Amino acid sequence: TQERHYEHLGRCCSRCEPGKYLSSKCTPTSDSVCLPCGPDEYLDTWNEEDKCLLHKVCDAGKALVAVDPGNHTAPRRCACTAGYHWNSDCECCRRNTECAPGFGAQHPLQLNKDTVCTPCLLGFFSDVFSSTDKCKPWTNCQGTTESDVV
Amino acid sequence: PPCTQERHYEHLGRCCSRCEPGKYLSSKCTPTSDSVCLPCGPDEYLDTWNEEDKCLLHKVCDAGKALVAVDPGNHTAPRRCACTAGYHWNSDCECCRRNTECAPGFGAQHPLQLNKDTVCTPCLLGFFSDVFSSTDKCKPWTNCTLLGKLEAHQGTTESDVVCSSSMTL
Ligand SMILES: [Cl-]
Ligand SMILES: [Cl-]
Ligand SMILES: [Cl-]
Ligand code: NA
Ligand code: NA
């Protein structure tokens, strides 16, 4: 089987499980020697690789941070920091749209996506530009969509 | 005043400091003591400099929609969700959709972005992809020159170079 095995010395020797690299090919005495990937390294396949793949750095200069895989078996994702979203056209993190007064941010907020803004409905207001703040209820004592009752 | 509304509250003729995001007002200030501000409990949050006697409860990210919480333990901000690995939030359906798979000869642009669809790009000469995958980038060809071997099979953007096992003089 090509999936679990490679051929060497006229026999089918076993490939390395995801998370492990092929340190030594099989011998006339031994099957393959497979060792765990080091820090920030991975292999997500049954393989014959002589080294693990290194996770791409998430560039802090682009406002990116790492999303932890909690394993050595998955490729690692990055994401824009809270309040920012990845734009594939600029290939850059943009500030999330601030919903103007009279509008509120829709929840739940989606990581790495821009804010959806919706108008405050009767009985609710928003007095700030914010990419996170929902519309707030009027305090019970005239209010508008942009201002609380006085 | 100079008791700044942004960071303070008035109580019994005194200027007292509001609690930081992530903490709630356990007890108001006294003549010889500050505000007692204590952390919000598990699953709870407050996202403003506040004078709240209790914190708000986080809603779970909807697993039925294939969403997962990011930094679920954050007490200082409203919760953010993201589609599970291999899926992206689609704004048209407001839902998680399976990531685009890059065909053989194409690779995923790295680093992969959480909650975003895979962007697929052609493998350059010297690199290949033999599978449909929303994660795999193009892999460099095996280097037979490095080993001083001849090639048994020419590489393509869809298949790896294969080195000969034969020796030459
Ligand atoms: Cl990676
Ligand atoms: Cl707006
Ligand atoms: Cl929340
Ligand atoms: Na607003
Ligand atoms: Na591919």
Distance A100 CA to ligand 2 centre (A): 4
What amino acid occupies position A8? H
B106 is annotated as contributing to ligand binding? yes
DSSP string computed for A77-97: EEEE-TTEEEETTTTEEEEPP
Distance of CA A124 to the CA centre of its chain: 34
C-alpha R_g of chain A: 26
For residue B58, the chain A residue with the least C-alpha distance is: A108
User: Mapping DSSP to helix (H, G, I), strand (E, B) and coil, where does residue A60 land?
Assistant: helix
CA distance B20 to B50: 7
Question: Under CATH, what is the fold of the domain A81-150?
Answer: Tumor Necrosis Factor Receptor, subunit A; domain 2 (2.10.50)
Distance of CA B45 to the CA centre of its chain: 20
Q: How many residues make up chain B in this entry?
A: 169
Write down the H helix ranges in chain A. none
Could you give the dihedral angle defined by the CA atoms of residues A56, A59, A62 and A66, in that order, rounded to the nearest 10 degrees?
Answer: 80
CA distance A140 to B138: 61
> Beta strands A109-110 and B80-83: pairing type?
parallel
CA distance A65 to B128: 28
CA distance B76 to B97: 29
What amino acid occupies position B78? P
Give the angle subtended at the CA of B34 by the CAs of B30 and B36, to the nearest 5°: 100
Partners of residue B78 in chain A, C-beta under 8 Å: 107-109, 132
| CB-CB contact of A105 with A116 (8 Å) | yes
CA distance B161 to B151: 7
| CB-CB contact of B139 with B128 (8 Å) | yes
Q: Give the number of other Cβ atoms within 10 Å of residue A13's Cβ.
A: 18
* Strands, E assignment, A49-133: 53-54, 64-67, 77-80, 84-87, 92-95, 103-105, 109-110, 117-119, 124-125
User: Mapping DSSP to helix (H, G, I), strand (E, B) and coil, where does residue A111 land?
Assistant: coil
For residue A133, the chain B residue with the least C-alpha distance is: B78
Which method was it determined by?
A: X-ray
Instruction: Scan for tokens 């990937």, then name that residue.
Output: A37
Question: Under CATH, what is the fold of the domain B84-169?
Answer: Tumor Necrosis Factor Receptor, subunit A; domain 2 (2.10.50)
> Beta strands B112-113 and A77-80: pairing type?
parallel
Q: Do domains B1-83 and B84-169 have the same CATH topology?
A: yes
Which of A55, A64, A111 is opposite residue B82, by nearest beta carbon?
A111
User: Mapping DSSP to helix (H, G, I), strand (E, B) and coil, where does residue B63 land?
Assistant: helix
Which of A56, A76, A108 is opposite residue B61, by nearest beta carbon?
A108
Residue B153's φ and ψ, nearest 5 degrees, are -145, 130
Tokens describing residue B1: 């005043």
CA distance B28 to B18: 9
Q: In DSSP terms, which residues pair with A22 in a beta bridge?
A: A34
Name the region of A78 (left: φ>0; alpha: ψ -120 to 50; beta: rest). beta
Distance of CA A59 to the CA centre of its chain: 13
The architecture that CATH gives domain A1-80 is Ribbon (2.10)
Partners of residue A104 in chain B, C-beta under 8 Å: none
Which of A75, A82, A111 is opposite residue B115, by nearest beta carbon?
A111
Q: What residue ranges do the domains of chain A occupy?
A: 1-80, 81-150
| CB-CB contact of A106 with A115 (8 Å) | yes
Q: Do A111 and B77 touch (CB under 8 A)?
A: no
> Which helix (DSSP H) or strand (DSSP E) does residue B167 occupy?
none
What homologous superfamily is domain B1-83 in, according to CATH?
A: Tumor Necrosis Factor Receptor, subunit A, domain 2 (2.10.50.10)
B102 is annotated as contributing to ligand binding? yes
Tokens describing residue A57: 């750095």
Q: Do A108 and B81 touch (CB under 8 A)?
A: yes
